[PDB]
Design a protein around this ligand. Structure first.
Ligand SMILES: [Br-]
Ligand SMILES: [Br-]
Ligand SMILES: [Br-]
Ligand SMILES: [Br-]
Ligand SMILES: [Br-]
Ligand SMILES: [Br-]
Ligand SMILES: [Br-]
Ligand code: NA
Length: 129
């Protein structure tokens, strides 16, 4: 599924992501835009053999199990395929764990490079919330 901007904002807010760990809704939408372009089915392979999955591009090296990342962890205790569903519940719960591990949203390199320090409120402007 490819979300619209305000559609994804409302779904993130319903799942408790707005202001989670101090990060306003616009930060999460911005990060979803540049990680996946709002597409739940997005996947990308990394050079070390791990793969990133879903709306927020969660890495198999640490967070989910895809059965082809030797030596990796499964800290969200989830199959990586669960992060590709049209329902964002699994991706949101895992992101909550990732953002709480000490480095904030700097875990998402596209957030640090393309969202951090910008006018992130523009990503929820004009949405009915
Ligand atoms: Br957009
Ligand atoms: Br594995
Ligand atoms: Br393969
Ligand atoms: Br683990
Ligand atoms: Br949803
Ligand atoms: Br933080
Ligand atoms: Br915001
Ligand atoms: Na893994």
């Amino acid at each position: 599924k490819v979300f619209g901007r305000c559609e994804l904002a409302a779904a993130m807010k319903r799942h408790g992501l707005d202001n989670y760990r101090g990060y306003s809704l616009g930060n999460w939408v911005c990060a979803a835009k540049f990680e996946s372009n709002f597409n739940t089915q997005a996947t990308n392979r990394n050079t070390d053999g791990s793969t990133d999955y879903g709306i927020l591009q969660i890495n198999s090296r640490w967070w989910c199990n895809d059965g082809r990342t030797p030596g990796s962890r499964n800290l969200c205790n989830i199959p990586c395929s669960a992060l590709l569903s049209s329902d964002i519940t699994a991706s949101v719960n895992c992101a909550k764990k990732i953002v709480s591990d000490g480095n904030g949203m700097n875990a998402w390199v596209a957030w640090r490079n393309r969202c951090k320090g910008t006018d992130v409120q523009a990503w929820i402007r004009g949405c009915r919330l």
